[PDB]
Paper text:
Inhibiting the catalytic activity of [name] has been proven to be an effective strategy to block coronavirus replication. In this study, we have identified mutations in [name]-[name]-2 [name] that confer resistance to WU-04. To understand how these mutations affect the WU-04 sensitivity and the catalytic activity of [name], we solved the crystal structures of these mutants and aligned them with the crystal structure of the WT [name].
Structural analysis revealed that the C-terminus of one molecule of the [name]/[name] double mutant was docked into the substrate-binding pocket of another molecule of this mutant, thus this structure may represent the post-cleavage state of the [name]/[name] double mutant. The [name] mutation restricts the rotation of the C-terminal tail of [name], thereby perturbing the dimerization of [name].
Author numbering:
A (entry chain B), B (entry chain A): 1 to 306
């Protein structure tokens, strides 16, 4: 019983975190086999960030200009390259603790675990969701760039996020492990503002299903609605449109509770129109949208197959 | 920037989780040096739990009656003993991944990270607070008994909780690593109900300070109160009494915000009597009490020493 925001165990990722220093700037890198991945803006001075030419700065740098330290051992850089916004430093030593890994690009609305690190040392782990405006609301202090977001798919650690930037609103922006930013953000000091955000509708419904599984049933009603007329209310309250694919994803939760997805939509409609009536749902007085349907299944297994 | 519920990296604890099997019952154990710690109720059948005499059941058990598995490797048990409510199985082999560790007994209101495990394999990590009624609001499924709570204070893992049981209200109860239950709970099927809970006042204030640091200022007022007049309202809404020790602990946050602790108490006073009027504080519509002042300082460091 119980439902909590839960991150994946970070051990396999901790064994890959290193410290990368170029000039006066120090951040975190991801050491997989004989390659260290880190944000390319480490090669920039404070003045370079105003208008950096990364192709020029990369040529000007030498292998010895990059100091990579895995804890107490210094790793010798023997090659440096750039894939989009990520710097790739080939090192002398292959990481003996490299896990089975993949590079994946997640979609807005999906969640992952963030291992916040400083000086190449992990500091904390928490779950984050890619918002529709392609930002994440994490907790980062100075020296956190290079921290990675990941999911564990049983035996494979799928890295999906590398932390690059903090926006003026306090939210955070970064790239996938191929150097491609999530959203329209660039790794330079220019006027970039996160777009207006929306609520992840399919995540709210899955979160309501988790409540029903854990005994919270006051918000349930006898009403049913159609996908079209629910999406009308959803747009009226800045909710993402609900698609048939989203309904299919919610299939398992609807199967174990016996509550049709459109019946939960009728309950969600009334909650949006009349509020929460001063009550709470899974320890929240707001509708939570940072739990994916799989995230719910992870903590709410059915009784169908025990 | 940002403020999130953040757990410690679980790697050092992941390397200590093992599987302990007695008869048909399988749960998790903590492998430190040559001793495996697990809940003693693993030696009970389903009928035994109704009225177990653990001293007798231990006599009937042999070393070979306990099957301990460190992942895929079977550990040879060479001794079984009982320290209060925890079973201690001495094994032939010392765990090479044992970190610098201590056993500590935490206070109500203090927080720790829970590494939820199943069949000796870590599944997730999240932050929990010891409630005043000596329960925790975690997320546990079948086979989670033996999961441990911990804090890391620079290379040292302080174990403070082992999960034993779920109460009828859905909350969870367990012991320290010396086998002493938190609260008046016993490892037997009896009429045991968690007492009525109260809100951790010093944690709410620290959380309100974190909100001010992160830009939330609407709940602030020019009102002032005394510790006596605040505690009258606190008891009136089932809040823990605020002591002078609690006020001193909040000293750094009050200095960093320029808000006197008793002025924040006045803000909490008005928030308790009339609510938040449809606004939010750090993305919550409730007053959060699972963040200790140290947890806030950890995520909101001052500029005094840069």
């Amino acid at each position: 019983s119980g439902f909590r925001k839960m991150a994946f165990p970070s051990g396999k990722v901790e064994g890959c975190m290193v410290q990368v220093t170029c000039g006066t700037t120090t951040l975190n890198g991801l050491w997989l086999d004989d390659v260290v991945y880190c944000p390319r803006h480490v090669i920039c001075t404070s003045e370079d960030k105003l208008n950096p030419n990364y192709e020029d700065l990369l040529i000007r740098k030498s292998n010895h200009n990059f100091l990579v330290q895995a804890g107490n051992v210094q790793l010798r850089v023997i090659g440096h390259s750039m894939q989009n916004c990520v710097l790739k430093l080939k090192v002398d030593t292959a990481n003996p603790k490299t896990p089975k890994y993949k590079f994946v690009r997640i979609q807005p609305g999906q969640t992952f675990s963030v291992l916040a690190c400083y000086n190449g040392s992990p500091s904390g782990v928490y779950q984050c969701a890619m918002r529709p405006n392609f930002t994440i609301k994490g907790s980062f202090l100075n020296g956190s760039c290079g921290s990675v977001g990941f999911n564990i798919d049983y035996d494979c650690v799928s890295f999906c996020y590398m932390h690059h930037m903090e926006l003026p609103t306090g939210v955070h922006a970064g790239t996938d492990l191929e150097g491609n930013f999530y959203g329209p953000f660039v790794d330079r000091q220019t006027a970039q503002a996160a777009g207006t955000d929306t609520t992840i509708t399919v995540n709210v419904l899955a979160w309501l299903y988790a409540a029903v599984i854990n005994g919270d049933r006051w918000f349930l009603n006898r009403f049913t609605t159609t996908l079209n007329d629910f999406n009308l209310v959803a747009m009226k309250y800045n909710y993402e449109p609900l698609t048939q694919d989203h309904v299919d994803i919610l299939g398992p939760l609807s199967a174990q509770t016996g509550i049709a997805v459109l019946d939960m939509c009728a309950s969600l409609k009334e909650l949006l129109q009349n509020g929460m009536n001063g009550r709470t749902i899974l320890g929240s007085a707001l509708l939570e949208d940072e739990f994916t349907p799989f995230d719910v299944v992870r903590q709410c297994p059915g009784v169908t197959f025990q």
